[PDB]
Amino acid sequence: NITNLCPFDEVFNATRFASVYAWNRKRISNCVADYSVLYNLAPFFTFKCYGVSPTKLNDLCFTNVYADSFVIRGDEVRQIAPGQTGNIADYNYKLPDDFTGCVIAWNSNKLDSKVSGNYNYLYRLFRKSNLKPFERDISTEIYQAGNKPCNGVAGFNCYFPLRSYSFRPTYGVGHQPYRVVVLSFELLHAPATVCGPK
Amino acid sequence: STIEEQAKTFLDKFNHEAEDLFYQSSLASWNYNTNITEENVQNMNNAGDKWSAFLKEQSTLAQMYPLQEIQNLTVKLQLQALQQNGSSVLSEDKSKRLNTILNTMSTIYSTGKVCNPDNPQECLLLEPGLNEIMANSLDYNERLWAWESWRSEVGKQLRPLYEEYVVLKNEMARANHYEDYGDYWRGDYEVNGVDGYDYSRGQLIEDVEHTFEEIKPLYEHLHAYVRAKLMNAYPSYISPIGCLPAHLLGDMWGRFWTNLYSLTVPFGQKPNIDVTDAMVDQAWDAQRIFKEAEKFFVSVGLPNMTQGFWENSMLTDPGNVQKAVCHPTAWDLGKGDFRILMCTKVTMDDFLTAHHEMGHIQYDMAYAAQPFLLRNGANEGFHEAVGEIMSLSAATPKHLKSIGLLSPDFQEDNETEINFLLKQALTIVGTLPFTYMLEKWRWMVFKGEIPKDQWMKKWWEMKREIVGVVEPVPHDETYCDPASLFHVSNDYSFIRYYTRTLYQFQFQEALCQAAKHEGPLHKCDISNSTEAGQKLFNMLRLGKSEPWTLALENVVGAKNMNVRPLLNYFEPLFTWLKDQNKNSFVGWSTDWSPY
Ligand SMILES: *[C@@H]1O[C@H](CO)[C@@H](O)[C@H](O)[C@H]1NC(C)=O
Ligand SMILES: *[C@@H]1O[C@H](CO)[C@@H](O)[C@H](O)[C@H]1NC(C)=O
Ligand SMILES: *[C@@H]1O[C@H](CO)[C@@H](O)[C@H](O)[C@H]1NC(C)=O
Ligand SMILES: [Cl-]
Ligand SMILES: [Zn+2]
């Protein structure tokens, strides 16, 4: 007898994805995790699991599952991986180096590109230090690039830290929007609630 | 923080905002050139004004990074590209005065027309009609009129404008810490900073004059062959020992000699290779021509065209409802957008134009991973030299029967390769003395070595001495004979047409060794050879980030411009020309004038 399915349809099949600087975390617990939504693969091509096998997903059982969702470019999907360096990995979304979980990415060009430019998707370009793993920095404090204290205003050597993406459909792949879901598998020495179907 | 780390942070902000505003300008420029509309004019003018207002502001902000305490040569290269003042070092009343002479010059050039002295109601513009007289007429006095009246009407109006144009452009370049405006033009080749790859601006003059001394044995044998063949079309007008009259060379200025092929053909009864009639029997269209072009580039290991290439390019004239500017262009809009605008007829010349514009896209695709100000050629002659070696391999009878356009039972003989190579040297060799002295005249006018009361005196003293071309009429200092050319009236550097011609055979001979080709260089096809494509791509990937002397070494193996690959290409022609010019005087006398 099957039980209540895990709400992955409100993660993958949403209509609003987040910016990468303000990525949305969803906690998933106390359901059966059917990972056979992979049958959407013809748009959903990228699927890369670290620390766990893709086929032995239902073999293991977990306490909590975190789904992290955002939009990046096509050329930045390689940065959503353990031990990567870039603009996204350092200031927007950092994975742990001992990351157990999967990264699911898919092209969203016919859903997130406007002919006048989709300026709704943001990313952090400047930050004083690299992010810790699973840290979320959403501050709009003026970045001090020089030696003057910048007085809370943007000018010479004092920049606004968040930049946009401006997605247009005639872009090449690598500048086209990609919706990314990162599944994070926890084992918190608790009753392991999230299990695959038996 | 250090002033170099504040400059890396300033360029990270710039590269995000320059890439966004340049795409909007290029997409608005694409929409006008494909759909000519007044709304497409206002979209093109407003998107290009925002990009110029942005680039003016970021030029002011980049000057606060001194370019002295910055030691990374990559960061230094894009700051000095952005720190270029231009005409902003001049005063504001002289910056509008310089822009007034520049816009008046293109107006006098394009809207200047010449009326015949037979009927006052009929007149002739340059690009239709007066270009047709200089190309196809075989009457002496008919093209003597069209040559003289273009220079006695339009060249007279540009003489007092050009004397004011030189003075203000020299004030602009001396305030930018050059020597003159010819020194500013030579700064495209200046590579100061790198050990082992340096190049000074005065070194370009010495390297151009050194390579030209070896072209003169090949050129004066082509000049002696064309002159002996033009004594049959215009008898009692050509001297056997004199120069060539300037109105008989196939066009308005004697820039190219390609329209002299009807009179200077070696073996006229044998036809050229033209697979245009073989194209229509196999029902080729514009899509087939361009998919055979990108088939050629994947055979050497370069990428195929993108998905947005075939969806966004204009490869056909869209009919007489959609009006487009029908000039073959390769477009690099940024952000992965590569388009080719072309109105492709099913012809052999559009088949080689398809390989030309796709060689520009493949080079735009290679340096796409550079910073925004390093996404160009290594210098101004690099980008056209790559597109020219693709048309060079595609037109060979080896390549033209491997795709099935020639017959399999086709035999090429020596009476057709001379017909091919002489048609090349009328276009390629015949333009190099014109290109060299027109820049050497301009380099000395800006340097002040020619005073303005002796401009046409030394214009024709150098046209006789270097090109071997004589004036048909006397000319005083009321004429301005250089400014009758487009590039002199429209303020364009002209030495890029000289250096591209030497880079082209330097590029072609290097990829010919890598493809291991049997015999003559003009039979080389670099197709099906990934060693020739991987040696090219190591230069194409750098863009503008390295020295051009280092990018030249990544293909050729030498650090400088070399003319020996060019003379190796025309070596079966030079042998046949030396045997033909045995009963004729090889050389010209600058004292002989036809008047
Ligand atoms: C210069 O800057 C680039 C990017 O900012 C960096 O990759 C490189 O290591 C720096 N140093 C040198 C010597 O190129
Ligand atoms: C390039 O794209 C064309 C078009 O589909 C394809 O036929 C060809 O095999 C591709 N070549 C490579 C090397 O991917
Ligand atoms: C490459 O080689 C194949 C097989 O020999 C041939 O059919 C094709 O025409 C060649 N392509 C060229 C020469 O461009
Ligand atoms: Cl002239
Ligand atoms: Zn070109």
Residue numbers in the entry:
A (entry chain A): 328 to 525
B (entry chain D): 19 to 613
Paper text:
Compared to the original wildtype (WT) strain of SARS-CoV-2, Omicron has 60 amino acid mutations, of which 37 mutations are in the spike protein, the target of most COVID-19 vaccines and therapeutic antibodies. 15 mutations are in the RBD, which contains the ACE2 binding site as well as the epitopes for 90% of antibodies induced by infection or vaccination.
We then studied the interactions of ACE2 with monomeric receptor binding domain (RBD) from Omicron and WT strains. We do see local differences at the ACE2-RBD interface; the Omicron RBD forms extra interactions with ACE2, including interactions from RBD mutations S477N, Q493R, Q496S, Q498R, and N501Y to ACE2. In particular, the side chain of S477N forms two extra hydrogen bonds with S19 of ACE2; the Q498R mutation forms two additional hydrogen bonds with Q42 and D38 from ACE2; and the N501Y mutation forms extensive packing interactions with ACE2 residues Y41 and K353. These additional interactions may compensate for the loss of polar interactions between WT RBD and ACE2 caused by RBD mutations K417N and E484A, consistent with the enhanced affinity of the Omicron RBD with ACE2. In the ACE2 binding site, compensating mutations strengthen RBD binding to ACE2. The enhanced interaction of Omicron spike and RBD proteins with human ACE2 is consistent with previously published data, and may contribute to the increased infectivity of the Omicron variant.
